[PDB]
Every structure is written in C-alpha cells, then in structure tokens.
Amino acid sequence: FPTLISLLEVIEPEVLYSGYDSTLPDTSTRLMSTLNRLGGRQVVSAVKWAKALPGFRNLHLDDQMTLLQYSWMSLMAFSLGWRSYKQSNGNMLCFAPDLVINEERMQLPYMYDQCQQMLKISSEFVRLQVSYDEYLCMKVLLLLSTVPKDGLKSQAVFDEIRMTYIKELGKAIVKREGNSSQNWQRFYQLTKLLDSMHEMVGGLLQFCFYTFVNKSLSVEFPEMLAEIISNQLPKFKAGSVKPLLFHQK
C-alpha cells in the first residue's frame, strides 16, 4: 500500500525562514554571512531528513557522515533550484520566504557570478518541467552520488540503497506521464541532469572553499557547516572523491 515515493513526500522538511535583518547595509559580506547561517540550519534539517530516509541508517556511521559531508552543497543548491522554480519560474533566487533575491539585488561584488550559477540550476527545472516526485527521487540520488575513490565501509549496503532509488526515479517518471512512450527519453534527460549537477555545483563549492579559507573576507560560517567544510575541503582538493555518473562523461 505505502510506496517509497509517498514516504519521500512525507519526510521532506518544511522550508526555513532566514530571519534576515533588512535594516542593515546591503553588503556582499553581510549577505554571504546571512546565507551561510541559513545554510547551516538547512544542513541540520537535511541530516534529520537523511536519518528518516528509508535505508540510509543501515549504512556504517562513517559512511553516513561521508555522504552528507560530500553532498551537502548539491543537496542545498538542488533544493534552492526547486524553490526558485516553483516560486518564481527560475527568475529569482528564493532562498527563504523572507529572503528572495531578484536580478537587481544580485548586482553585488562576487555575488553576481555565483548567483547566476544558482539560477542555471533552477533553469534546468524549467526546461524539463520537473515534477515534485521526480525532484524528490533525484534529490536522494544526489545524496548518494559522490563517494571516496577508495570506497565506502558498507559498500554492499550502499550499492543496494542507490539501486533502490534509481528504480524509484523510474517509478516517478512513469507516474508523471501516462504515455509510457517517453519513459526512456525522460530517464535519459533526468540522469543527464544528475550527471551535470557535479559540474554546476563545483563552482559554488570552489567559491565557498575560498570564502572559508580566506579569513580576510570576513565571511562568517556557523559551527556545524565549518566542521563539515573543514573535512570535505582537503578531500575534494586532493582529488580523492569521485562522482557516480550515469553516462559517459
């Protein structure tokens, strides 16, 4: 009776408010620090979501930690893309109900380029007219799409979970359309989007890494996010991580 997709709908966390203070000088540093504060709280939600995600807690605890540390920015950027798609059709960055960034508020130092990168992710949801259930299944697969080159401790459990949610994405596609005639074409398009997320998020991550390590910029990070980045960053820069791609890339 209960389907995996119906459970994904039910565990999806509610959207957080930023509590942003509009009376303060609109500056790039203040904005980046406000966004990181929101990001730390969204990462906490995401960890609670992963604990509730069927199958995830069967992984060794060190693998649960690895997957969340490696994929957090993909998860956050994908969900920002979805919110921006549903709330503005990809025209504004809809970070929170009380923090919406339109094109002219983007005209800020360093900010404009990173903001355009985030809009491109939203623009793919518009292009493909992604359904909610396709989005939820894809989001699981982002949690499961970056791993150490040397492998995981519970590799057999991981391979089982990942294959389970690849199957579930297929079920979401069938549920969407009704003419199964495009089901393979749709699966191809969405797995190409998954593969492309590694490149689309890579530039966000490099910028985050720079603002993290370069204390001169005075960008603030909250404690749990700082801990995660401090563990993720050396593995990423050393080339010890690999993306799990569906297609020849």
């Binding site: 609670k48 604990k51 509730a52 605890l61 649960q64 930690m65 995660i228």
Partner: peptide, 12 residues
Amino acid sequence: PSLLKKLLLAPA
C-alpha cells in the same frame, strides 16, 4: 565527536 556525528547519533 563532531556536531554532525552527535546529530546522526541522536534518537529521532
């Protein structure tokens, strides 16, 4: 223990 580990270990 990191904050992430504590959260993963917390009942919920």
